[PDB]
Every structure is written in C-alpha cells, then in structure tokens.
Amino acid sequence: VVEAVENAVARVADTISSGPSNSQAVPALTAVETGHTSQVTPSDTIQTRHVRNYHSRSESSIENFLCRSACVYMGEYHTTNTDTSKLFASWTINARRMVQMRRKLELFTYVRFDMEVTFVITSKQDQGTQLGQDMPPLTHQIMYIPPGGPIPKSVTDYTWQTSTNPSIFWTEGNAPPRMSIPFISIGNAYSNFYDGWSHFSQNGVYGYNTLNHMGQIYVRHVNGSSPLPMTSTVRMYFKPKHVKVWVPRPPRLCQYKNASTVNFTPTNITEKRQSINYIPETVKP
Amino acid sequence: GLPVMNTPGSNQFLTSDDFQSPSAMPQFDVTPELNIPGEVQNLMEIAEVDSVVPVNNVEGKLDTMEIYRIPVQSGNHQSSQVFGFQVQPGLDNVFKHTLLGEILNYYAHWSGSIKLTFVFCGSAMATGKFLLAYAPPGANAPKSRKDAMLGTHIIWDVGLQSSCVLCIPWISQTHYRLVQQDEYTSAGNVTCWYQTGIVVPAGTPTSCSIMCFVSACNDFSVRLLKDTPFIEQSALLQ
Amino acid sequence: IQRTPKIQVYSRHPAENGKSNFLNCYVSGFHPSDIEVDLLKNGERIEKVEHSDLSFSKDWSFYLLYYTEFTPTEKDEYACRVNHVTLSQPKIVKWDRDM
Amino acid sequence: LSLLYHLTAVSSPAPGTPAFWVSGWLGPQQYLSYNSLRGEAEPCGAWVWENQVSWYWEKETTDLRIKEKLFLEAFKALGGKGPYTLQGLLGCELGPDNTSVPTAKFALNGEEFMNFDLKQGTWGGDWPEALAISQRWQQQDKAANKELTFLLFSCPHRLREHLERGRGNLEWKEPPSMRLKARPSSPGFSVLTCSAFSFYPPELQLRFLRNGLAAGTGQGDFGPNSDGSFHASSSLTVKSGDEHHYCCIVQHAGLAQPLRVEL
Amino acid sequence: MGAQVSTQKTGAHIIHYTNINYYKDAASNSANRQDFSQDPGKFTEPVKDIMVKSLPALN
Amino acid sequence: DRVRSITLGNSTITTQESANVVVAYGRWPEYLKDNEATAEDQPTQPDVATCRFYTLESVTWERDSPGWWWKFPDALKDMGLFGQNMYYHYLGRAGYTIHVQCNASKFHQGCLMVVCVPEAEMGCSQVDGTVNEHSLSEGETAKKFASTSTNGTNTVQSIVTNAGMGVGVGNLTIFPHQWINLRTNNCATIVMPYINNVPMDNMFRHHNFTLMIIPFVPLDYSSDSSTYVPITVTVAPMCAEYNGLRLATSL
C-alpha cells in the first residue's frame, strides 16, 4: 500500500491593474486610534500594471524558523584529579544559557514541541612533565535523571547502574550520539514568561524558575584509566520539532545578565545621525 | 546480508538535517492540547503590524520619548524640510529596531511593498496640508518641494480622519534585495514638505507633532535564514 | 523576634586578697548580632580588657565572655555594664564575692 | 565527641566589624578562629602544637572562603528591607566504630528554617525564604557536591585523624576549687552559696545537705573561663540558724571523693 | 508497506519523494516542515465592527 | 457611529466619542467546556454579583508624566463579591472588559497609548537582585514609570523607554491596544479573554496581565484652559468561575 499526500503551495497575492480615479472613496484616509492596521495595497494610491507573483512564504513558517540545532551547554571533566567534583559534569536542562536561541524562543509567550538532542564530545591530554603513551579509545556515559531521582555522589557510586533512567554509552571516533524527547510538561505548554510567585503569600521565588522541573544530565568517563590524565568537553545541541506557539511578543532590546531573571541595564532606542533631514549623497562626479 | 556501499557525507553532523531517531521514553502520554488564543503560524503575520518609528534620532534624545515625534509649527517655514530618510528597512538606524526590522534582520533577502502611516497630534483647531514623497534610486535626495513633487507623492489634508498612508511600491530590477544593502540594491528615500502650512487660532500651544508607523503589505516575503547581529554574550551563564 | 540578655559575674582563681585573679563577665541569651559590654572598677572602666569571639548555642542564643586581670581587694571591687538593643537602660551588675 | 562549625553572617555590619565569621568546636571546646576581614584561619595553640605546612590549615581557608561567599550572596535573594542575620551549624559525629552521622542546619533571625538533605544533596525547608535561598545557593552549579563531600568524606576524615594525632589533648580533667560561703539576707534567713573553679570536663552535680538530709539542688550557674575549664556557682536560701550543719555534696570527674566541704 | 509519496519543493515560471516510518513513537518522526497557512486578521484587525477600506474610518 | 453603550449586571456605560471596540485576539470570553477541564467538583458562577463594572481611582495627567501600570487581578481583590469569592476559593477564571476615560477641550493636545500585556514579567534595578510584591503592585493605586534610570533599592527598573521589561516601547503595538488622541476620541475599550497555559489558576499567586498607559505626546494647553486633566479606568469581569472552596486566606 502507498498513500498520496497532497500539500498546498501558499504564494503571495498578485497585483491588479488600476487606472485614474476621481470619487468620494478614500482608501488612504484612516484612523489608527481604533487599533486597526490599514489594509491598503499599492493599486489603491497609484496606477499599476498586472503582475503574476510567484513568491512563496515558506521559509518564514514557525517550523522552518525554529528547527535548527544550537548549542545550549558546554562542560568540562577529567579522568583523574585531586578534587573528586571535577571528575564528572552535571547540569540542569533549559534553553537559557546561550543567548542566540533564548532570544529566538522568547518571541512567543507559550510554546509546545518535541525535542531532538545531539552531543559532541572531545578530549585532550593534560600537558605534563613527560609525554609518550599508547591509549585505547575512550568511552563516555551520559545519564538523564528525571526530577526527583537519586543523585550520583561520585564516579564510582552505585547510582550509575541506570536501571530505569535512560542512558547512552558512546566510544570516541563514531557518529555523535542523538536521541528524541517528547513534550514532557504538566501544563498544556511550556512558558517562557511567568508573572507570578511560588508561594501563595506572594513571596518566595519569582519568575521562570518556578516552572522548569525537567531533569538533569550527568556525564562521566567509563574507563577509569589514564595514568597520564586526560580532560574532556561535552557540548549539547537542541532542535525542536512539531512546534506550536502562542501570543507573540516584541524582541528583546537589552543584553541579558543571567539565566534565571530578566534583569537588564537601560539602553538606548537606536543610534544617532546628524539631523532629522540628513541623507548622504551617493551620486557624485 | 544485503550488500551496501557508504557514500560521502557519512557519520557527519549537519545542523540543519532532519532524520528520524530513537525516542528515549517509549510510549509516553502527552498532556492534551488546549485552544489558547493568539496562535502564530508564520512570521509574516508579525511584520504586518504597525509599530512606531524613531525618526528624531539625534544627540540628546536617544533615551527619551522625544525620539518618536516629529516637530512642526505655524508661521512661514515653507523653505524648511520636515523630515527625510533612506528606505533601508534592515540596515538604517531609523528602521532596524522596529518589528519589521527585527524580523528582517533574521533573513538575508526580502521583497514587497511597504506602508508608512502618519498621524497628526495637534489640537482640534489646527489646520494644515503636507506633501509626502518617495523617490526611486538613481539621483540625490531632493532639496526643494519642486524637486520632490516629481516622484511618487501624496498630499495629505488634516481633518477628522487623523491618519494618512504613503504606500511605497516595489520598483526594482531584481526580484529580491539584500537586507545588508549596498549601492547596487538601493531603494530610494522619503521626504516631507509643507504644502500650505499650519494655521491655528488664539489660545492654543505653538508647536505640534507628527508620528510615523511602518508595516508590510500582503505581497511581502523574506528568505535565506541567518543570525541576528544584535544580541551577543561574552561567556556562558547569561 | 528578639531576646533579652542575662549576665553573670565570677572569677577563675579563688577570691583571695593579694592573690590576683581573672574576673569573668559572662553574657548569654540575646539574638541581635551586636552588644556593648564594659567592666568597671567602682566606675573605673577597665582599659586592659580582652574578649572572646562571640559564638552561639543550640537554641541560636548568642553567648560571650569578657575576661580581665584584677586583684580582689576589700577596698575596691568591680562591676560590669551591658548595653543592648532590647533594654532601655544599660544594666550594671557588681562583682559578687561568693558567686 | 563531635566536630562542628558555627557560621554567622550579618546583613549590615558596623565600621570595623566583619560581615562573616566562623568558629570551630571539636568535643566540648573550640580550636579555630576565623573571620572575613583577614581571610585565613587560625589555630587555638593548645591542640596540635604543629604548624601544618599549608596543608591542614589552608584547606580550612579553602572551603571557608567558599562558604563566606555563599553566605554573603544569600542576602541578595531576599527582597525584604529589614536587616537580616543568617546562622549555620555544620559538622559530624562518630558512630560505634564507624558510620559517622552528619548535621547541617541553618537559622534565619533565630529561627531554624532549612537544613541539608543528603539523598538528593539539596538545602530544603518550608518557608518562602528557605526556597529562595536554596534556589540561589544551588544555582552556583557546584555547591551541592562540594557540601556533600564536606559532610561525608572530609569531616569524618579530619575527625578520625584528630582522634589519633593529638589525643593527649583530650584528658583534661581537674578537680575544682570550691567556695561554700554564707550570705546575710532579710531578717530570718541566710543564703548558702557553693562554687567550683577550673574543672575541665563540663559535667558536675550540685546538691545541698542540711545535716544528712538532701535539701535540693539550688540554682546552679555554669560559665566557662578563658582557659577551657569551667566555673559553677549555686545558691540556696535556708534558715537563719543551723547554718553550720549545711554541707553540700559535689562529685566531679576530677573528684575521686564525694567532696562535701566545710564552712 | 505504509509508504507516503508527496511532492518536492520546486520552482515555477520525478517531483515527489517517498517516506517510511520505522519507530513506534510519533515523537521520533521527522519535522513537519511543509505546512503553510496564514491568518493575519487575528493580529492586524481585531475590531468588533467591520471596516471596509474605502469608507472613512469614523462617522 | 461614535456613540456606544455597554451594560453588565446593574452597570451601564455610555459614550459619545468612541473609536471602536478591540477584541483581543478575535475571541470572546467563554465558560470552560467539559472536554478541556481537569478539576472534578462542581464550580460556582455568581454571574451578576461579580460580572460588573468596578471603578479604580483616578490619576492626574501632567505636563511631564511618564505613565502608569496596574496588575490584573490583585487590583480587584477588594471589590465586593468578586474579591470575596477570590479569598475563599483555590481556582478562578474570568475574562475582562477594560474602559479608559479621559476628556479635554478642543484647545488641548496629547496622545496616550493603552495596552494590555499578558505576563509582563519585570526586572529589578539591581541586576543581581530580586523584586518585591510591593514594588510590583499596589492594589487599586497605580505604579508610576520614570523618565530616567532608577537606582533605588528592590524597585523595578522604571525607565519608560524600556517598559520595565527590556524591550522597546514603540514595539508594544504587538499586543491588544488602543490610542487616545485628544482631538479624536475620549475613551478606549478592550475586551480580553482568559489567556493561560492551564485551564484555571490561583488568583493570588499569578498576575494574569498588566494594563499600561503611556503618553507618547505630552499634554499641552495655553494660559486659560483647565490645568487639571484626570484619567480613569473601569474594569468588568466576564464569565467568572471558581473551584476549590475552603477557609479564607490571609495576607
């Protein structure tokens, strides 16, 4: 069996031809007080010809605008050290530490999508007093812990059994690992903005951190090796799909300051010119 | 088993691909869907909404509301120009931080017509007429009302309806233009002149203001995604 | 949310006249972070005085001790004044020769 | 026996006053002193008599700086106006032969409001301030693990290594110096007073005997000196006559005899 | 075999591809990047009374 | 065509200088349906004792006034039975009709923007700090924007060019909005449905939207006109619903 799928091409409006006029119709006069935005085309104010337009608005869909991978975290960890906390990497999942995707997501108040995650891991050898060795390829474990699960205390802890948490084992030299996550939220959509508190007495914590609760990532070396220690770096890449968005907002003008709040330093509206009439001359002899 | 061959491009990570992949939580039950008001389906719906333009962007007025209003007054000021600027919706300081400009700065190309709406904000006893003119590229900006009247213009008469529209039509050699514009893909300029002047009775304030709104028409489109040059960070945790 | 302090005076060595000694003014039971404590010789506010680093107890009660060098004398003995945020009057407790 | 740490941070310090200071007590007495105006820990001088070469006395500074900055940052999570004061009690104590038991609790303006939970390495409590301070503290992306190591693999280790490195400083036990005297009072009575000077261990029992009859405990006051030892002093109001029979009983770890003192 | 055949993105002035789904979860399919529909009047003219573009806005 | 009348409960508003009525996203307030609810008990619907016009207190438009903002709900928590139901329930839901009034003679000039912003999360003046509830709202009394950058303490970054949210104010027309041009109309009307990511929510913990009023062109007159020009706001709930009856909250 095979089914044919028919998808409609959506192209912009054509231009009709128009001649002179002298009448009591007035398309160019209006009143912006009503909140209305004027629906006037060029063929209302000038004489136009007929144009068959073939342009398409397909690259400005939400699916095509948001569906690209972007870095959202970067972390380091060692094979051996005298600290015991630098032996693994750990963090909480959100798209608010790398500003380019934060600004792009925050054009809308509510979003809902499935996610696709890719990792990129690299290693290097710590520069020491003497080199020269032969080392097999390294293996890394990536564990995803849902909210409320037990937390590893070290690299030799029992918790790494991953009896029910989903985990990835990856050895260097192969394709980057990749997996898919569905829409995991207790609400009906994620929220980029929240004007509320956590406690009913109107105090506690304010804003976005009241609603995130989507888990953690832990990353470690599986070998437990390297008489000469190495150090690695992991980078995570999100990509949403099957997206829906609600209630657009104005883009952000000021530079971010931290990942939790929306605090800012006051900035200007735009940059200056010479005067309200200045245009530079470009046709010079 | 089945004989196969690996072609170039294997085991690479291309950021803009789309393949299927294994799910890490099999048989998950998603929350049902709610009909929320205000669903967006295309960014070209946002660019079709007016937004105030900061035309008066001179020194000393970049962080005040004065940046939005164009001054005008009564008396003999016919030799003086009201305002003027270049049509670069994604590169000019005047247009680049509006809704239309912020949407354009995510793309490389654009095409279509534009609308500039003007609203007069004087008292109800003031009268006047203005000339609003657009000049396609190929010459310098006009320096008198006589030169400006030779382009695409409209004469706006202030009355009950407080607003007027100057539609800027698409007149170009190519089908698209660069958002980072140059001599080769210029679009022209816009100027404003007194047509008869402002007349008021006694007992009113002297000066009046005009405001500008910009939006896109129904034949507008963009293409070739890129990154925006406005936001930037120095380290993580920001 | 505040607690009023309580004071007790004593001395490490037995109070033998001529036998010098270390006098102790022990304050406890108050939950601001700061306090004023002085020891005086019949009004002679002691110049040579050193304190201890203020710690707190299991009920988060602040305690401290001012200890100084003196000589028990049937003529002159000592007192201890304490000024606080809770008490409108700086309290003076004079050196008991038996406690 | 237990090793514990008192941490204190004030919101608005006076001129010349530190904004953060820590004390360290192992067993019933102190061995450390530290604040925020100098920036490194000190000894007490009668515990190890060994100036550890930047390896036991700077790990102290190493984590005390971290806790200092956490405490001084905590105040910028509360939106309130009033002056604050944050206190912390940390440490651990020994089991039977192994299996130490830790403790980490915190108080705000004199009210115990949050503590540390080990199975998820998180600070937690009930008040809104508890949640605010906990969120801010754990958003520094490493503090939970650095604290959990301090409660399970550093304090028991230092505790056991102090158990056998200078244990010759744990046998402090010295009989007291007693002052059973009399006090004139309102016509009809007289006040007995019983003292005890410079006894090293804290435990001490005071009770009054009329002739051979128990008379109660009195009001026993207890206060440490500048030496680690302690002073006790109780009082009791009794009759005006028969005062030369009262002979109170006191036993102490330094007293090998139920010392009843004569006037 | 449950294959979907649909047209490709071409221009204007052999043309369709084939797809098969291999996994049980719809969260694992590929992106739905061929759905195009506008609705601008929701944001550009949300007024209760209709305006007709050739009549005066008021009166 | 410029006259208009609105009746709700035992309240009526008339106007003779109306522009139009904005319906936020083309959708009117409605009751929750059976195939989208989650709470299981029977709700209460007072229906004329709550759906009613309440009037806040006025503000004085001067020569140099940056603007004002209110938070909804929590501006209506002391308005009769609507607030009483608010104190005794755990979940509530309602839409709104907002009406702003400001009149002046034909010899004055000015221009105001009236905009309702869903979830207008605001930022403190100290960038590494947090906000209070007192510096966010004041009940029925409005909070005032500032013309320059504020320093203060715990206070919102109140400078008006950024709207306390880190954006450009001239871009606020993406939300439902109207203008009051002192030579065209004297009133503005917005009808706003219930907007959230959950079907119902607690009315004390969460500020649904913010009403901002910002003068783009300042007020001006000359030498005999009235110098006192007030602005007044009037709000009416619509299709209110409550679930989860228990004892009364305190603050």
Side-chain angles (χ1 to χ4, degrees), chain F residues 146-242:
Chain F
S147 55
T148 72
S149 89
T150 65
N151 165 38
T153 179
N154 284 285
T155 58
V156 178
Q157 183 60 266
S158 283
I159 186 173
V160 66
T161 45
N162 285 314
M165 300 196 294
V167 297
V169 63
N171 285 335
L172 274 192
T173 66
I174 188 68
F175 297 121
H177 75 294
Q178 281 214 355
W179 294 89
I180 290 175
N181 197 357
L182 278 191
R183 58 170 270 144
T184 300
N185 52 323
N186 53 16
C187 80
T189 315
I190 293 165
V191 178
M192 167 94 88
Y194 184 71
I195 294 165
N196 215 353
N197 58 330
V198 285
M200 302 180 75
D201 200 357
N202 180 261
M203 284 193 163
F204 274 81
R205 210 165 44 166
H206 183 204
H207 302 320
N208 263 345
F209 65 91
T210 296
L211 169 74
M212 285 166 178
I213 290 168
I214 298 147
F216 268 76
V217 183
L219 180 81
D220 216 3
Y221 49 88
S222 179
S223 71
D224 82 326
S225 314
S226 299
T227 80
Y228 171 80
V229 184
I231 304 177
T232 298
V233 193
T234 315
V235 183
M238 296 175 86
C239 293
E241 271 187 313
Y242 308 92

Side-chain angles (χ1 to χ4, degrees), chain A residues 12-13 15 27-33 36-42 45-46 53 55-62 64-65 67-70 72-74 96-100 102-104 107-108 110 112 114 116 118 120 144 166 174-176 178-189 237 239 241 244-259 267-284, chain B residues 11 13-19 21-25 28 30-34 36-44 46 48-50 54-59 62-63 67-68 70-71 81-86 93-94 96-97 99 102-103 106-107 111 113 115 117 119 138-141 143 152 154 156-157 161-165 167 169 175-176 183 189-191 213 215 217-225 227-228 230-233 235-238:
Chain A
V12 305
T15 300
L29 285 187
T30 186
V32 307
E33 290 83 16
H36 192 257
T37 300
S38 195
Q39 301 290 309
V40 185
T41 67
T45 79
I46 59 162
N53 215 317
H55 299 178
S56 183
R57 277 167 169 172
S58 52
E59 213 157 7
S60 68
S61 295
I62 309 299
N64 296 316
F65 170 71
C67 190
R68 295 250 172 120
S69 294
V72 289
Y73 187 75
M74 275 166 307
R96 282 168 79 99
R97 294 186 190 93
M98 289 262 101
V99 305
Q100 264 180 3
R102 181 177 185 178
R103 185 175 191 280
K104 175 185 294 201
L107 283 189
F108 313 92
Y110 302 122
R112 166 185 183 111
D114 307 308
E116 187 174 4
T118 310
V120 167
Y144 163 64
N174 298 338
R178 153 177 301 198
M179 86 200 74
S180 281
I181 315 295
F183 168 65
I184 52 152
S185 182
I186 59 183
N188 290 95
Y237 287 81
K239 165 179 174 164
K241 32 177 190 162
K244 287 186 63 95
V245 297
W246 297 270
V247 187
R249 300 173 80 88
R252 185 163 168 117
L253 180 63
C254 298
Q255 305 297 328
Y256 297 102
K257 294 292 183 172
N258 41 44
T267 58
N268 298 347
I269 294 286
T270 188
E271 282 95 28
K272 63 157 182 172
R273 46 169 175 157
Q274 280 195 1
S275 70
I276 203 177
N277 286 326
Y278 181 77
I279 297 170
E281 291 183 354
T282 47
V283 178
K284 313 192 63 199
Chain B
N11 306 330
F13 174 35
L14 167 62
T15 286
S16 66
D17 58 358
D18 50 334
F19 307 114
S21 64
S23 180
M25 309 176 195
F28 190 87
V30 287
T31 306
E33 202 177 344
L34 190 74
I36 314 179
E39 196 204 345
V40 186
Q41 294 183 294
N42 206 314
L43 285 178
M44 281 292 109
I46 295 172
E48 289 191 340
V49 171
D50 293 331
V55 179
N56 193 23
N57 55 346
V58 311
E59 276 289 329
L62 290 175
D63 49 345
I67 205 178
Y68 285 109
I70 318 176
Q81 195 182 354
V82 182
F83 70 77
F85 47 71
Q86 277 164 307
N93 282 316
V94 162
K96 76 189 190 178
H97 282 316
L99 280 184
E102 293 290 352
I103 297 287
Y106 273 114
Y107 288 87
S111 62
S113 298
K115 298 194 294 280
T117 314
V119 60
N140 284 319
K143 301 175 77 177
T152 297
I154 194 177
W156 168 36
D157 180 45
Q161 328 289 312
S162 48
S163 293
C164 206
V165 182
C167 199
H175 279 247
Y176 287 82
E183 281 184 352
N189 44 31
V190 169
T191 54
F213 293 63
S215 86
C217 292
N218 67 340
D219 61 334
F220 200 91
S221 68
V222 303
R223 62 176 202 199
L224 195 50
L225 270 301
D227 266 0
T228 188
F230 293 144
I231 200 78
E232 52 95 20
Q233 68 188 314
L236 192 66
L237 188 53
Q238 164 172 359

Side-chain angles (χ1 to χ4, degrees), chain B residues 42-234:
Chain B
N42 206 314
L43 285 178
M44 281 292 109
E45 296 168 357
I46 295 172
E48 289 191 340
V49 171
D50 293 331
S51 45
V52 193
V53 184
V55 179
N56 193 23
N57 55 346
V58 311
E59 276 289 329
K61 309 177 181 182
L62 290 175
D63 49 345
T64 75
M65 305 291 314
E66 203 167 2
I67 205 178
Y68 285 109
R69 70 180 82 104
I70 318 176
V72 68
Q73 45 172 337
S74 81
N76 193 353
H77 299 113
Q78 292 226 334
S79 67
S80 314
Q81 195 182 354
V82 182
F83 70 77
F85 47 71
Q86 277 164 307
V87 179
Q88 290 170 320
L91 184 49
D92 197 357
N93 282 316
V94 162
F95 282 113
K96 76 189 190 178
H97 282 316
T98 67
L99 280 184
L100 186 54
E102 293 290 352
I103 297 287
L104 262 64
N105 277 261
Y106 273 114
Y107 288 87
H109 302 156
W110 65 278
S111 62
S113 298
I114 303 183
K115 298 194 294 280
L116 292 171
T117 314
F118 290 90
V119 60
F120 176 81
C121 291
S123 64
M125 310 306 275
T127 63
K129 291 173 200 250
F130 300 90
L131 195 140
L132 306 149
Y134 165 64
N140 284 319
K143 301 175 77 177
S144 65
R145 186 183 61 183
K146 190 200 184 319
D147 287 335
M149 77 158 184
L150 294 183
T152 297
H153 69 274
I154 194 177
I155 302 174
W156 168 36
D157 180 45
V158 177
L160 262 57
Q161 328 289 312
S162 48
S163 293
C164 206
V165 182
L166 172 63
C167 199
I168 293 193
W170 185 251
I171 302 161
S172 88
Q173 51 196 350
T174 58
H175 279 247
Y176 287 82
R177 270 168 165 135
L178 295 185
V179 167
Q180 188 72 227
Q181 266 192 26
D182 43 358
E183 281 184 352
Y184 181 71
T185 41
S186 298
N189 44 31
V190 169
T191 54
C192 195
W193 308 85
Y194 288 108
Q195 171 86 327
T196 57
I198 282 173
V199 194
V200 296
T204 61
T206 301
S207 297
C208 303
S209 295
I210 278 179
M211 289 208 301
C212 192
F213 293 63
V214 60
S215 86
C217 292
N218 67 340
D219 61 334
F220 200 91
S221 68
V222 303
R223 62 176 202 199
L224 195 50
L225 270 301
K226 75 168 169 61
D227 266 0
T228 188
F230 293 144
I231 200 78
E232 52 95 20
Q233 68 188 314
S234 67

Side-chain angles (χ1 to χ4, degrees), chain C residues 1 3 8 10-16 24 26 31 33 52-56 60 62-63 65 67 96 98-99, chain D residues 6 8 10 21 23 25 30 87-88 107 109-110 179 182-183 193 195 197-198 221 223-227 231 235:
Chain C
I1 302 169
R3 295 178 179 85
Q8 68 199 286
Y10 54 101
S11 295
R12 181 197 298 165
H13 304 296
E16 295 294 329
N24 281 318
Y26 178 85
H31 195 290
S33 66
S52 179
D53 50 355
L54 66 95
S55 182
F56 57 94
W60 318 98
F62 286 86
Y63 64 88
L65 160 65
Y67 55 98
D96 204 84
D98 294 332
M99 299 177 55
Chain D
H6 297 173
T8 300
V10 184
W21 63 85
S23 68
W25 306 70
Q30 178 193 7
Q87 289 177 48
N109 274 343
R179 294 292 182 183
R183 297 277 287 164
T193 177
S195 309
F197 297 132
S198 298
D221 293 332
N225 318 289
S226 159
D227 61 357
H231 163 68
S235 296

Side-chain angles (χ1 to χ4, degrees), chain D residues 76-92:
Chain D
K76 300 185 312 206
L78 318 163
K81 62 180 290 294
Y84 293 116
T85 293
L86 189 52
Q87 289 177 48
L89 180 61
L90 275 68
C92 83

